[model samples]
Target: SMEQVAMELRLTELTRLLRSVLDQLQDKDPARIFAQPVSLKEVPDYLDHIKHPMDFATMRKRLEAQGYKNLHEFEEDFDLIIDNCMKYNARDTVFYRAAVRLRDQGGVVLRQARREVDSIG
Candidate 1:
């Protein structure tokens, strides 16, 4: 169906853009801040499993409305979104749980990178 094709294309575009960002980050931090690269295919499945409240279309619109020009900026906002979910004790929701997994994985890498920088300093 057209919807499925559209979704696949959107996901593919996102994956490519994300992979570019990850590559740039990896270049800067040879220690690999993202662990294994985030799977482009797996992300959609996770979103589907969670029945994500915000789809790519909605998310893109929101990010644009917030003046974000890139995924990195959106990711910062996403962290805040996840934090709010946690504060509300919304662990029962699939979106919250999936967000936590994504957040924690990224957090671990960021924390390690910070520690490495601190050690060097």
Candidate 2:
């Protein structure tokens, strides 16, 4: 009953971490391919294969609404964009390769951040 402190610090750190991740993802895809929803007219089969589609705009919108409760919840939305792209596009495609980089490279810091906020890593 006398050990806890700095609850505010935890939230600030987590918000910074999430915003960094969003920045990285946004900068990586400057062409705006992943900036918005996939139009059925543009990619007809997208929704057919990708059960849950997500994009930077939607993710950012959620953040604006304060929809996420923790790093793990943000991770799901973050990975959804990468994983959905990989699933819809086959190997050797540009989008597929791009998602690979996002998954393996962009993902590194998020995992680290997840641990950092939870236990001060």
Candidate 3:
């Protein structure tokens, strides 16, 4: 009973925070590069370089699916996306710079989410 009841509130917080994170990321991405998956045709070696390709589109659907109830799992997907970006692009490249900023913002939201959810749940 406790588990089920707390589940609802925590889910509400997590879903809200997670969506907020994505929205912030999309807005920060001026080039719209993070909106969708990297094109295989354009970057044929991308798959070779990245083992776990992630994008906002994929993250949105995964959350929509509600396939799992873990917020951190989704959070880690965010990490994967940024990690892939920084790793693929050189330090001087625009992609790397964007990834660094995105990562910091993501940390900001995630930390806020933790405080809210932990206090409430």
lDDT over C-alpha atoms for residue 90 of model 2: 87
Tell me the tens digit of each residue's lDDT in model 3 across 13-81.
677766776787677777776888999999999988999999989999887665436666877888898
Error of 2 at 93 (Å): 0.9
Q: Residue 94 error for model 2, in Å?
A: 0.9
Q: For candidate 3, report its TM-score.
A: 0.82
Q: Is candidate 1 or candidate 3 better by TM-score?
A: 3
Look at candidate 2 and give me any clashing residue pairs. Answer: none
Question: Which candidate order results from sorting by lDDT in descending order?
Answer: 3, 2, 1
lDDT of 2 by residue, 35-113 (tens): 8887889889777798989988898888766566687888898788888888888898988888777677666677677
Q: Which candidate has the top score in TM-score?
A: 3
11 in model 1: Cα distance from truth in Å?
A: 21
Better model by TM-score, 2 or 3?
A: 3
lDDT of 1 by residue, 13-60 (tens): 554554443334334433332234234475554433333332233344
Q: Candidate 2: what lDDT?
A: 0.77
